[PDB]
Design a protein around this ligand. Structure first.
Ligand SMILES: [Ca+2]
Ligand SMILES: [Ca+2]
Ligand code: NA
Ligand code: NA
Lengths: 224, 224
């Protein structure tokens, strides 16, 4: 996160760090929702470690759990190309609250919150402590005007600033973009997906449009 | 590869593309040597697809084989932090000549060849067709001096140019850096690991120093 500050311990308990250098969210206590581009494909996979429970990745309170299998969005090709979601089944649950995902378009607007352990600047190192930032919605029309690479409107939600240096960055991929719902609970509207650089002038962040995929995500989760 | 030219079909039969968007070398017909940072850890993994046999990833002749297991260098932390190697066991062999690795420092000098399907410029798209370039050895002293991040001298070999636009880039990671040995056969001296930008002025490419790890790589392979 560029232009971020530390999340408090316990603030976003659904956050998970994944050992390929991505974030994720606890969709179920034993299922992590992340980006398709954070995984290689679908199959059995006991090589990923999920770190839950803590903002400080060096904390002895961390819960470290291995994966058992991965389901990458059917049809996934590359970020700028859409369908950037995946599920990781965990061998054991992480006993933390889950993050509900958006199943309608009701929340695909307003001011979002992002969080991750990715870089704090283009080209930078990953972070020890979870950082957070707020980023405002940017319409598909405004995002496509800014963009070089294809925007698949139905599959991508943009957010960020024109010149303010506040954005997700490398290693934030797969984390949730979220906001409050009408019942004052967090709801996931995006997955950190891609951007042209980080916090570049005139460029925004691009996130998987979770409401488009929520049905497919539930179907995938039932396979795990 | 920045400043690359297309590799001919058959030129480097040992090149492998991996479905997380990395390169690799055919270390054994059923074992790909790649970068640690291209995998998540060690364990079972049937989710990676290796594409062998072809310079054109879309070729009707491509050999697409799934993984069965991954072994990430024990103690790997961080590209700039060394030990950037991993092995991927394949469910089926790729019937191509394998790339012998260096076990001595005899070839850690001179002009190397690099190849990959990574970007041809910073922020570019991955390539359909394999590209190659030549990059000269750069001493650890010159490389350290140039670098903003940790250079672990024994674990990292640098190569490239001060200003000429010829380098590996994003998505070339995991591919081999190689040259001829005394028997005029290809030998692998490096694994594409990291760099500050791509072909940036005053910056080089940083490669895993394979001779340091050759014994550990063979012992890992023996267990797969
Ligand atoms: Ca949209
Ligand atoms: Ca060295
Ligand atoms: Na911007
Ligand atoms: Na340079």
């Amino acid at each position: 996160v560029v232009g971020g500050t530390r999340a408090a311990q316990g603030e976003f308990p659904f956050m998970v760090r994944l050992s390929m250098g991505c974030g994720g969210a606890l969709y179920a206590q034993d299922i992590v929702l992340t980006a398709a581009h954070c995984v290689s494909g679908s199959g059995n996979n006991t090589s990923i470690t999920a770190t839950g429970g803590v903002v400080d990745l060096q904390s002895s309170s961390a819960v470290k759990v291995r994966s058992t299998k991965v389901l990458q969005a059917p049809g996934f090709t590359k970020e700028t190309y859409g369908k950037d979601w995946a599920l990781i089944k965990l061998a054991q649950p992480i006993n933390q609250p889950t993050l509900k995902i958006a199943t309608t378009t009701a929340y695909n607007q307003g001011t979002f919150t992002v969080a991750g352990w990715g870089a704090n600047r283009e080209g930078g190192s990953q972070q020890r402590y979870l950082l957070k930032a707020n980023v405002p919605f940017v319409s598909d029309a405004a995002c496509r005007s800014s963009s070089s690479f294809i925007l698949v409107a139905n599959e991508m939600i943009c957010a960020g600033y024109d010149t303010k240096q506040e954005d997700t960055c490398q290693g934030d991929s797969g984390g949730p973009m979220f906001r409050k719902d009408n019942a004052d609970e967090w709801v996931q509207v995006g997955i950190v997906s891609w951007g042209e650089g980080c916090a570049r002038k005139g460029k925004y962040g691009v996130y998987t449009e979770v409401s488009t995929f929520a049905s497919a995500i539930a179907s995938a989760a039932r396979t795990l």
